[PDB]
């Protein structure tokens, strides 16, 4: 496990990648459920770097109908909703270290528009250490982003039956390489992947969760196939066995035809993340960045897309990584058999 | 002692009086030595009144030459010094509950300029409860403020031989009545007194700390007399037995002529405070507002007066109340033999 | 200092002397200011002795006019006042270990009348170790109780000028030897002393606090004499220096003629208690049993006497032990020059 | 659940069995993630038994590539690696109570070589209570050991297709009956099993994880068979469905030919342990001793064997218990179809 | 006050000066009453410096007849008495940080002989910060040592009547400058003074505690004179008013002629320490090193000399600083009227 001393050094390293120094101000955002060791370590490390530091504690926000303890599960209001003073208290800072899992909101977007950069850190210390950010990871992620911002279409195929096409261009590319160096940037330690959104009402085809593919926030390896039929950017059929029914039942509870929209789409670039990791953790350890980010996955998502000016504001939200896919941007393959093949600069 | 329910209720009471309601944002300012029960009662109470809330934690500021644990003793920089983001974090709020004892500073003056209010609350709960603030305390204190602002001169006599003159006018009256209701106001729960400052280089005569008179932050009842000789606003001679030598040596330590300057002067109007209270407490219990505010005391101060655009910025600061004094504003007496006599409204 | 293991062992010892075993039920009474180590040790110890145990936590009770943190200083309502259910929950136990300092009250007296026995234990572990109860202390105390119950009068002389006479007979003798073995008995770990009360309206003479004598809760060694003139069981004069005036001032604040009545009178039998102990502690640490029980002191008290059916229910309460006294019961001396001389079985 | 009282009494029981008394010294070894309750109980029980005690605290060691929070998952360096002084601090003691799970390493082996004995205690209190050690467990486990030390080979068959042969003799037999009574002896509260290692480069045949069989540290009951093919001490083939792919992925990650080596082999003799227990626990709750020690299991392990001078020093370590097995020493059955049949004195 | 951050940084400074780096082992010694912030800060700082570290926790040891919570007040056995394993646990290390105040004893001396060095650090962080150790301080203190090791006699005179003489030479001089750089060396952060002991049975004359002088551990400033008459290295008479009677009573209580022995003698060389500091603190804040080390004091002690193989191992230990003294080595002044005059290289 990770000692207190190692944990402050890790924060020293990541904050330094994030351009924290004596000119900079750091605000550590926490609530009752924040990991006190991580908060502590972020406060000490920041002070070691000569930054001006303060913590901001907000009362937790609860969505009454939300289930489980993964907060990515229900995308709605946040602790900042209606608390304009606290938001200003965070805008005042250059860098916010977020340990309370503030969700994407117009309130957060307003923080980012002032130049403030935000670094999310909520995984346990041990996950943090295995996926400790590097500049190499930034270069690789950015090489891939260049290639994605020039793409007009995205195609996914798998031997299991995925055949999925997504026109692009209408929306930007997002990257997460694990540190918050550039102003107005949000990032997450740990990460190491990229995505965009399909043009509105256009994503078509079928996506097949094979045996061994994952649905978050359920955090299970599927034991039977689920076939998703998608038309004009919405899931219209969900088929297969017990997982299929559990999925169908879970999406129905939200009682909203918006849950079925396809939101982000992208691939993983983090070789230190492992598909097997999730099997060694409890549900309540964290949100499982290993599943999201592992090298050569295809990650797609359902539900809200308000983050980029999409129509959908629904709380239901799934992230589903697929193994063993072939992924194509226009004519060219970025991933083949779940091995990353292009750009050459993006490869491990 | 004071339970958690009673503490919360007392903070509801004082925050009501400080005009906290649903239109308001409260910031609870704290550091690692803040009492957690007090912080939690303030946060809970503010939410009961439907105000938005957040807590602000700052790292402790240490002045390396300072002695004791009393923070009034050493007036220098503070954790706000060069820490604008932190200051903006407080400025966001309508009302700051200070549980860390931020000392008067240009940075704090800026906060009040914006219209933000500051309530200091750091004494132990039992003390807080005994001097719970009232609208009647404000009335009486504000009645005294009227008289004081007109006054051209202050004069103090005692049978023990105090004979002290101070010319007024050049500097404002300042009140403390225990709550922060007006915009840009600072007050301290608990309090109930007022002071001003004498004209530059002008104060003249002798002050005698009789047997039983008090020096803060030493927190001793004097057992022998201390005679202080004052020329052109400065102490030039300190005479007596052991307390005098103890006092001279304390002042010498600071190695600075600024320490001998007289700062605020004024009288106490808090009948629920008690001169005997100090001898039932330890030093580190707090700063002993009972000695400062007890009804009919004369309280004068030394050292820094940059608070009001004075020349002196030195850390060394004593507050000294005296019993059994007659105090005269111009020709008219406020206190006679330690009893408040004028204004009538201001009496108990 | 005392380790956790040694503290549980000490409690095992005292609870064994208090006749705790597998037939008995023990309730540990605590509130938020209770020493958690002592509570934990009481709970562990009782369970080691196979007793059935539980803890009762009450919300603290504050007297709004009370000053300081010692609770013997203000005798009025308690946490049990108005809380019949909690009282009953205490009544169910055979033995209550009180770690919250429940003052004597009608509710407590009712707990005692059900057979329930109560042991107070609030002093720090180190004082508790030093004055760990023995059977031999009980023997010595009871032998003095035998003598005191036959007494028709008590007389106190001292070279410093004490000359005090009190008829007895009207009221019982109370003993404290530091454990709670008999049903319906209250006792206090640590102690080792006994007292009674003088017949109503009858105590006459002078008691002189010599240099070095103590007033509780002030917890000072007197540096100047205070002379107490007493007539028909009331102090009618208090003369001397600063201590005199401080005492006069303190008693006045209560605005109650009753504070000046003489309540209990007795002597100490605890050689392991030391008159010097007090100047090695802080006011916060405890209520100072060393001062009340030290061998050969004459201890007297002012204020309430509703404990024994007296007229006075006032909150002001002093305990004042005097060194170097001769104490006579009828014509027979029990203490001479602060040394215990009779009964022979009560001596060290 | 288990109280503090009970937990301490369990440590007394176990420490006594482990021959702790007034002649002995106990070091309680710990880190930031140790259960403080277990620590305190070990400390206090050691003092109740009159031993001299201290605790040693090491800062935690993280293997940057390790996953999950079970420390049996990565057997590499430990917090003792290069910390010679800490090693000597543990060598000073007669008995180390290990509450941090010190992996078997050259440093621990050395400690044991000084005569120091070590008792591992890291399972949750309830698990500790369910498998509280007995002298009778020791007898049954020693009776089995006799037969193991007499064997020239070990053979496992099962209806599912296990057909596995292991020449014995090169390496010694090791027992675990739950307490550390003998000098230089390491044991684990709880346990109740025994094992040895096969001769170098010799183990042959196949081992079949049937439905219901367990891989540690994954902590799953397999839903599909996995077949392990073994040649000359090494797994050379892993076949089945999803469990098999996952397993293969996990072993490959470590990128070491060494992970594939068969290490210890043996059977379970703890009837208080239970194959079903694991499905009643979360992954972070413990290491799952139930799964390792249950009566009649066959337990084999992969990876490192430097414990006993074997060539392999790798981190990847699996323990795999198999149900329903026929286990033979030479030609003689010690277990048939998961029931223990010989020796008779080893049986329930 | 001092933040965690700052406190960690101070320990780096101090441990660097104590020559801690990658080659060294640091052991941090503690007990249940050790300040955890200080413990953490020391553990952290030694890691930041690449040292190997562990903590050793000893259960607290309590001398049943000890009074108060200053541990210098009773120098008998310690928590290491009889605990050889723990002593070895500490000898294993190159540098021990003592956060529990191991008293001087045959065990602590033995540790030091193995070449292990020791740094005591128990004063509150704020104090630690005010007298932060410097190389210059060492320079000044070794200069004074030079002088003292040459001296054949020490003589103290004061206007108040001190007239005291002590042959030197039988025993070594000892320095304390704040850091433990040399192997075999004990020091204390904070300090800055030096002392030796007088030849057996030889110190003669009178030492007068004037008004303003201090007795440790009573931690009072004397209000009346106490006169100590000294013959053949023992106090034979103690005279004055109330303080003298108190002191006599305190000494008698231990019932041991060895308490009256004159032990170390010397003077203070620390200008950042202040004679007034003590009056700003509470008894349980620390041991008042300000009072022991202030520049120009003469400090003498009573009770045990066993540390140097002296005859007396009694627990009653007093430390007594006098101001305004002339101190002479042979016939030359090192101090006059409480100001240090030789050697010139020791002056501030
Ligand atoms: Fe998503
Ligand atoms: Fe002031
Ligand atoms: Fe009383
Ligand atoms: Fe294993
Ligand atoms: Fe000493």
Which of D195, D79, C112 lies closest to E54, judged by CA? D79
Chain E residues with a Cβ under 8 Å from any Cβ in chain C? 31-33, 59-62, 64-71, 73, 217-218, 220, 223, 241-242, 245-246, 249-250, 253, 282-284
Answer yes or no: do D53 and E59 touch at CB < 8 A. Answer: yes
Helix, strand, coil in percent for chain A, rounding step 5:
30, 30, 45
List the helix and strand counts (H, then E) for chain A. Answer: 8, 20
Which numbered ligand comes closest to the C-alpha of C261? 3
Nearest-by-CA chain D residue for E83 = D52
- Going from the Cα of C216 to the center of ligand 3, the distance in angstroms, rounded, reads 9
Answer yes or no: do C274 and E253 touch at CB < 8 A. Answer: yes
Q: Where are the beta strands (DSSP E) in D100-252?
A: 117-120, 153-157, 163-167, 174-176, 186-188, 193-196, 204-209, 214-215, 220-221, 226-231, 234-240
Which of C64, D309, A196, A45 lies closest to B13, judged by CA? C64
**B342 alpha-carbon distance from chain centroid:** 22
Q: Do chains D and E touch (3 or more CB pairs under 8 A)?
A: yes
Question: Which method was it determined by?
Answer: X-ray
Residue E194, CA distances (Å) to C332, E301, E348 in order? 58, 13, 15
For chain D, the C-alpha Rg in angstroms (whole number) is: 19
- Alpha-carbon distance of A225 to A239, in angstroms, equals 8
- Alpha-carbon distance of A104 to B31, in angstroms, equals 30
**Deposited resolution, Å:** 2.3
Which of E260, E257, E234 lies closest to E247, judged by CA? E260
**C99 alpha-carbon distance from chain centroid:** 15
DSSP-assigned beta bridge partners for residue D226: D209, D240
Answer yes or no: do B54 and A83 touch at CB < 8 A. Answer: yes
- Alpha-carbon distance of C269 to E186, in angstroms, equals 44
**Cα dihedral sign for C182, C184, C190, C191?**
negative
B331's CB contacts (< 8 A; 6+ apart) are none
- In chain D, the largest separation of any two C-alpha atoms, in whole Å, equals 57
Binding-site residue numbers of D for Fe cation are 264, 317, 319
- Alpha-carbon distance of A312 to A305, in angstroms, equals 5
Is residue D129 within 8 A of residue D304, CB to CB? The reply is: no
Is residue B227 within 8 A of residue B159, CB to CB? The reply is: no
C36's CB contacts (< 8 A; 6+ apart) are none
3-class secondary structure, E213: coil
Contacts of E among chains (3+ CB pairs under 8 A): A, B, C, D
Task: Work out how many CB contacts closer than 8 A connect A with D.
Answer: 75
Residue E137 known to bind ligand: no
E43's CB contacts (< 8 A; 6+ apart) are A4, A5, D59, E28, E53, E55
**A236 alpha-carbon distance from chain centroid:** 25
HSE-up (13 A, CA, CB side) for residue C280 = 25
Which of E126, E183, E159 lies closest to E3, judged by CA? E126
- Alpha-carbon distance of E306 to E75, in angstroms, equals 10
At A215, phi and psi to the nearest 5?
Answer: -120, 125
- Alpha-carbon distance of B286 to B122, in angstroms, equals 7
Which of C160, C253, C170 lies closest to C212, judged by CA? C160
Bond prior to E217 in cis (omega within 30° of 0): yes
Chain B positions in Cβ-Cβ contact with residue E211 (cut-off 8 Å)? 241-242
- Alpha-carbon distance of D48 to D69, in angstroms, equals 33
Chain C residues with a Cβ under 8 Å from any Cβ in chain D? 3-5, 8, 40, 43-44, 47-48
Is residue A265 within 8 A of residue A301, CB to CB? The reply is: yes
Q: Show the CA angle centred on residue D87, arms to residues D83 and D89, nearest 5°.
A: 115
End-to-end CA distance of chain C: give it in Å, rounded: 26
Answer yes or no: do D218 and A279 touch at CB < 8 A. Answer: yes
List the helix and strand counts (H, then E) for chain C. Answer: 8, 20
Q: Show the CA angle centred on residue D276, arms to residues D270 and D282, nearest 5°.
A: 110
Residue D225, CA distances (Å) to D144, D239, D243, D266, E17 in order? 30, 8, 8, 21, 63
DSSP codes joined into one string, E119-145:
EE--S-HHHHHHT---HHHHHHHHHHH
Residue A166, CA distances (Å) to A151, A163, A195, B77, B92 in order? 11, 10, 12, 59, 45
- Going from the Cα of C147 to the center of ligand 4, the distance in angstroms, rounded, reads 76
For residue B90, give both structure tokens.
């407080």
Which of D66, D67, D14, D11 lies closest to D35, judged by CA? D11
**D275 alpha-carbon distance from chain centroid:** 15
DSSP codes joined into one string, A213-256:
-EEBTTTEE-SS-EEEEEETTEEEEEEESHHHHHHHHHHHHT--
- Residue given tokens 């507002």 in the structure block: B289
Is residue B41 within 8 A of residue B8, CB to CB? The reply is: yes
DSSP codes joined into one string, A92-145:
TSSEEEE-S-PPP-HHHHHHHTTT-EEEE--S-HHHHHHT---HHHHHHHHHHH
Chain D positions in Cβ-Cβ contact with residue C4 (cut-off 8 Å)? 40, 44
- Alpha-carbon distance of B109 to B87, in angstroms, equals 10
Total residues found in chain C within this entry: 348
Is residue D319 within 8 A of residue D148, CB to CB? The reply is: no
**B131 alpha-carbon distance from chain centroid:** 14
Is residue E292 within 8 A of residue E268, CB to CB? The reply is: yes
Q: Which of B54, B55, B99, B115 to mutate to test the interface with A (most CBs of A within 10 A)?
A: B54
HSE-up (13 A, CA, CB side) for residue A144 = 33
- Going from the Cα of D230 to the center of ligand 4, the distance in angstroms, rounded, reads 18
Is residue E83 within 8 A of residue E108, CB to CB? The reply is: no
Which of E213, E217, E291 lies closest to C276, judged by CA? E217
A302's CB contacts (< 8 A; 6+ apart) are A235, A259, A260, A261, A262, A263, A316, A317, A318, A320
Which of E188, E143, E171 lies closest to E334, judged by CA? E143
Is residue A285 within 8 A of residue A124, CB to CB? The reply is: yes
Helix, strand, coil in percent for chain E, rounding step 5:
30, 30, 45
3-state secondary structure B25-82: EEEEEECCCCCHHHHHHHHHHHHHCCCEEEEEECCCCCCCCCCCCCCCCECCCCCCCC
Is residue A130 within 8 A of residue A178, CB to CB? The reply is: no
DSSP codes joined into one string, C192-226:
-EEEE-PPTT--EEEEEE-TT-EEBTTTEE-SS-E
At C213, phi and psi to the nearest 5?
Answer: -70, 165
Q: Do chains C and A touch (3 or more CB pairs under 8 A)?
A: no
Q: Where are the beta strands (DSSP E) in chain E?
A: 25-30, 52-57, 95-98, 117-120, 153-157, 163-167, 174-176, 186-188, 193-196, 204-209, 214-215, 220-221, 226-231, 234-240, 262-268, 298-302, 318-322, 326-329, 332-336, 339-340
For residue B267, give both structure tokens.
């009288």
3-state secondary structure E247-264: HHHHHHHCCCHHHHEEEE
D95's CB contacts (< 8 A; 6+ apart) are D15, D18, D19, D20, D24, D25, D26, D27, D51, D116, D117, D118, D119, D180
Answer yes or no: do B242 and E212 touch at CB < 8 A. Answer: yes
3-class secondary structure, E270: strand
Q: Which of D32, D64, D67 sits opposite A3 (nearest CB)?
A: D32
Binding-site residue numbers of A for Fe cation are 264, 317, 319
Which of B132, B130, B131, B94 lies closest to B115, judged by CA? B94
Q: Show the CA angle centred on residue E204, arms to residues E201 and E206, nearest 5°.
A: 140
B201's CB contacts (< 8 A; 6+ apart) are B232, B233, B234
Strands D174-176 and D339-340: unpaired
Is residue B260 within 8 A of residue B230, CB to CB? The reply is: no
Contacts of A among chains (3+ CB pairs under 8 A): B, D, E
For residue A78, give both structure tokens.
């946040």
For residue E32, give both structure tokens.
């249940």
A309's CB contacts (< 8 A; 6+ apart) are none
- Alpha-carbon distance of E83 to E89, in angstroms, equals 10
DSSP-assigned beta bridge partners for residue D204: D165
Answer yes or no: do E68 and C275 touch at CB < 8 A. Answer: no
Q: Which of A3, A5, A44 sits opposite E4 (nearest CB)?
A: A44
B273's CB contacts (< 8 A; 6+ apart) are B131, B190, B192, B289, B290, B291, B292, B293, B294, B295
- Alpha-carbon distance of A101 to A89, in angstroms, equals 17
DSSP-assigned beta bridge partners for residue C316: C74
For residue C109, give both structure tokens.
């007296």
Q: Show the CA angle centred on residue D30, arms to residues D25 and D35, nearest 5°.
A: 115
- Alpha-carbon distance of E165 to E328, in angstroms, equals 9
Strands D193-196 and D174-176: antiparallel
Element (H, E) at B234: strand B234-240
Answer yes or no: do B66 and E5 touch at CB < 8 A. Answer: no
B19's CB contacts (< 8 A; 6+ apart) are B95, B181
Which numbered ligand comes closest to the C-alpha of D265? 4
Q: Do chains B and D touch (3 or more CB pairs under 8 A)?
A: no
- Alpha-carbon distance of B259 to B74, in angstroms, equals 11
Answer yes or no: do E83 and D55 touch at CB < 8 A. Answer: no
Element (H, E) at C312: none
Element (H, E) at D51: none
- Alpha-carbon distance of E174 to E145, in angstroms, equals 8
- Alpha-carbon distance of B266 to B194, in angstroms, equals 6
Helix axes D4-17 and D36-48, enclosed angle (nearest 10): 60
Element (H, E) at B290: helix B289-293
Q: Where are the beta strands (DSSP E) in A11-87?
A: 25-30, 52-57
- Alpha-carbon distance of E10 to E97, in angstroms, equals 14
Q: Do chains E and A touch (3 or more CB pairs under 8 A)?
A: yes
- Alpha-carbon distance of D310 to E338, in angstroms, equals 72
Chain A residues with a Cβ under 8 Å from any Cβ in chain E? 3-5, 8, 40, 43-44, 47-48
């Amino acid at each position: 496990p990770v000692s207190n001393a190692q944990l402050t050094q890790m924060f020293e390293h990541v904050l330094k990648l994030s351009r924290v120094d004596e000119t900079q101000s750091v605000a550590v955002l926490k609530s009752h459920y924040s990991d006190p060791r991580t908060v502590n370590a972020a406060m000490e490390a920041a002070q070691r770097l000569k930054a001006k530091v303060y913590a901001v504690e907000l009362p937790a926000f609860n969505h009454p109908t939300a289930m489980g303890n993964d907060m990515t599960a229900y995308c709605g209001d946040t602790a900042l909703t209606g608390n304009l003073a606290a938001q200003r208290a965070l805008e005042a800072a250059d860098l916010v270290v977020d340990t309370m899992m503030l969700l994407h909101s117009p309130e957060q977007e307003q923080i980012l528009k002032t130049g403030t950069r935000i670094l999310l850190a909520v995984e346990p210390p041990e996950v943090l250490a295995r996926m400790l950010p590097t500049e190499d990871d930034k270069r690789r992620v950015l090489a891939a982003e260049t290639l994605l911002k020039q793409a007009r279409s995205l195609h996914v195929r798998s031997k299991a039956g995925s055949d999925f096409h997504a026109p692009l261009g209408q929306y930007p590319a997002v990257t997460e390489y694990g540190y918050a160096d550039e102003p107005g940037r949000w990032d997450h330690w740990p990460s190491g992947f990229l995505f965009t959104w399909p043009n509105e009402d256009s994503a078509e085809g079928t996506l097949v969760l094979d045996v061994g593919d994952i649905i978050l926030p359920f955090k299970n390896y599927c034991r039977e196939r689920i076939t998703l039929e998608i038309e004009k950017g919405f899931i219209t059929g969900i088929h297969g066995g017990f997982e299929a029914e559990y999925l169908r039942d879970y999406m129905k509870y939200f009682n909203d035809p918006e849950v079925y929209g396809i939101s982000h789409i992208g691939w993983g670039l983090q070789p230190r993340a492992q598909w097997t990791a999730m099997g060694l953790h409890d549900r309540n350890d964290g949100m499982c960045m290993d599943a999201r980010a592992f090298y050569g996955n295809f990650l797609f998502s359902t539900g809200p897309n308000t983050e980029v000016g999409g129509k959908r504001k629904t709380p239901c939200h799934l992230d589903i990584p697929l193994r063993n896919c072939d992924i194509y941007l226009d004519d060219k393959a970025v991933v083949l058999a779940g091995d990353v093949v292009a750009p050459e600069e993006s490869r491990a």
